[PDB]
Structure 1
Amino acid sequence: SCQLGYSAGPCMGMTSRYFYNGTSMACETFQYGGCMGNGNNFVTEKECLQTCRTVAACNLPIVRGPCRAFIQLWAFDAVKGKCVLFPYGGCQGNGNKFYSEKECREYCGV
């Protein structure tokens, strides 16, 4: 699924949904029609990421993004070689974002 491109489906009940973009290694949004899609369709970026993220995300930059609904999440600091805490803005981030220190450790080593 994570490998599949997004699918809006034939319906017209447009909604914003998340799909994992393996090129950007980021979950992004798309307008889903309400019926007939594929598995690369998530309601939250959390789900999308915990489902589709890979270890290549450990090499990605720590992105706060442009939004201000700040939440403190974990991310891997490649320079220090450790999982650090940062405030994610709520939108347009990438895969190097974990929802627990443990998860960050599990993905990027310890």
Structure 2
Amino acid sequence: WQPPWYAKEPVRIGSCKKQFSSFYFKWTAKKCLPFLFSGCGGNANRFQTIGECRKKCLGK
């Protein structure tokens, strides 16, 4: 299995100043991992639940 392109982008908290419990694929660990998204300025490697991160980045 190879993950799609967005699951390999670097985690980016972004430019705003709130918090939003999120998950990203740490593609060199092949795990979904929690992180706090700021609310804006992120990238495509972000998911609200861990399942969605597993569905898309692991093919689950």
> Does the alignment reach a TM-score above 0.5?
yes
- Structure number with greater Rg is 1
SS in 2 for 1:102: helix
The offset of 1:80, in angstroms, is 1.2
Q: Percent identity?
A: 30
- Runs of 4+ aligned structure 1 residues displaced above 4 Å come to none
- Which of residues 99, 103, 106 in structure 1 aligns to 2:48? 99
How many pairs are equivalent? Answer: 56
Gaps of 5+ in 2: none
- CA–CA separation in structure 2 for the residues paired with 1:79 and 1:91: 25
SS in 2 for 1:79: coil
CA RMSD, Structure 1 to Structure 2 (Å): 1.1
- CA–CA separation in structure 1 for the residues paired with 2:33 and 2:17: 20
The offset of 1:81, in angstroms, is 1.1
Gaps of 5+ in 1: 1-54
Aligned residue number for residue 63 of structure 1: 12
- CA–CA separation in structure 2 for the residues paired with 1:91 and 1:73: 13
- CA–CA separation in structure 1 for the residues paired with 2:34 and 2:46: 9
SS in 1 for 2:25: strand
Higher relative contact order (CA 8 A, sep 6+): 2
